[PDB]
């Protein structure tokens, strides 16, 4: 029969009041014979009715993919409400239920530090700027880089790693031309996390 996958909203969407966070209930392996799917949604046990079914999508491996999207309130999510998707279909003996929410636990504020390139790397054509983010809980986060109000896209960020005190840490590395660094340009690491004042902090770094 069909299989169901329930996905949380993007950290950024939950964290920026100008964005719309949504939870997504994806049903795969829906058959051509019975494409009809019924969604029921629940927030902390209480049925809500504002979910919207996305356009049905032919997959070409014999099956359909059917998607229900539920808009959620920023604070609802951050307060840790539980969102239940229940899926019914003729090819299913019993309806399938899935539930996600934010990881549980007392949110902790990340400390953010920027680290300039090692002198040993000043030999290379490009150089690394390090943004250390440690002591955050829960692991939901967004890290980006910018300079002169423009996004700098040449970075990579590690996954978060569970530290020994029960919080998380990560490192984000931005790779700039050495010239750009030597010319005095200011580079900024932006961190969005629920436990930061206004979900936001910025740290800057220059020669």
């Amino acid at each position: 029969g069909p299989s169901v996958f329930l996905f949380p909203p993007k950290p950024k969407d939950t964290l920026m009041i100008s964005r719309t966070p949504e939870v997504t209930c994806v049903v795969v392996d829906v058959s051509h014979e019975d494409p009809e799917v019924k969604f029921n949604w629940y927030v902390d046990g209480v049925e809500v009715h504002n979910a919207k079914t996305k356009p049905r999508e032919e997959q070409y491996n014999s099956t359909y993919r059917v998607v229900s999207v539920l808009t959620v309130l920023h604070q609802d999510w951050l307060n840790g409400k539980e969102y239940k998707c229940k899926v019914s279909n003729k090819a299913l003996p019993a309806p399938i239920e899935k539930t996600i929410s934010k990881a549980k636990g007392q949110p902790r504020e990340p400390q953010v530090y920027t680290l300039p390139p090692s002198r040993e790397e000043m030999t290379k054509n490009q150089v690394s700027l390090t943004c250390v983010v440690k002591g955050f809980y829960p692991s939901d986060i967004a890290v980006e880089w910018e300079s002169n109000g423009q996004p700098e896209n040449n970075y990579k960020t590690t996954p978060p790693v569970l530290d020994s005190d029960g919080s998380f840490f990560l490192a984000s590395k931005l790779t700039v031309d050495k010239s750009r660094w030597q010319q005095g340009n200011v580079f900024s690491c932006s961190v969005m996390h629920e436990a930061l004042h206004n979900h936001y902090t910025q740290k800057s770094l220059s020669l």
Binding site: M16, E144, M192, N198
Partner: peptide, 13 residues
């Protein structure tokens, strides 16, 4: 006060 990210509203308290 409020926070902005590349000119987009983040959050206000």
């Amino acid at each position: 006060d409020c926070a902005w990210h590349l000119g987009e509203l983040v959050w206000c308290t």
